[PDB]
Design a protein around this nucleic acid. Structure first.
Length: 118
RNA sequence: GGGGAGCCCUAGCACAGGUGCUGCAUGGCCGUCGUCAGCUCGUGCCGUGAGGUGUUGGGUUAAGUCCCGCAACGAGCGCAACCC
């Protein structure tokens, strides 16, 4: 499934503007663009969804942050079904250092919903 | 009959007074740049740090007025509004 549906439509891309370490995950580089090796993918993927299975089998959440048309749409959609918060918007500065600030904004938006129903 | 009080007279005294200088010792009060849109606070991030950031970028407005971007998210005095 993973390997076989992946060759369905995605793998390698980008014109040789490649970061060193990333190309350790890479086989070939031809036809003009790199070729992703689905092996290391599935390695880091059994690992990934092991991590994800655990963290989801004790409750905790993780984000979906995507801000490029494509990605953007999907994330929010999936997020709603996934429950978890989505960031398809300007990932604002401080969000994960300024928790008290963003929480200010939140409580105020809750208050928007408050003073709106009155 | 005198002493005492508001009460005026004269010497003496402590004093008043002076629109005499000093706005380069000052308050207060007006000017003026100028209704020009300007001066900053808060957590976070960048910078060894002074500090920067926010406020530099584009369209727009009477406007730091609003939008877009965006390492920031906002917040106060200004502009406006509450006043005639």
């Amino acid at each position: 499934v993973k390997e076989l549906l992946e060759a369905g439509v995605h793998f390698g891309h980008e014109r040789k503007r490649w970061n060193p370490k990333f190309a350790r995950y890479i086989y070939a580089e031809r036809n003009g663009i790199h070729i992703i090796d689905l092996q290391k993918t599935m390695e880091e993927l059994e690992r990934t969804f092991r991590f994800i299975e655990d963290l989801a089998m004790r409750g905790g959440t993780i984000l979906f942050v995507g801000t490029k048309k494509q990605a953007q749409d999907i994330v929010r959609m999936e997020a709603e079904r996934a429950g978890m918060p989505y960031v398809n918007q300007r990932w604002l500065g401080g969000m994960l250092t300024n928790f008290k600030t963003i929480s200010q904004r939140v409580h105020r938006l809750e208050e928007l919903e408050a003073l709106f129903a009155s």
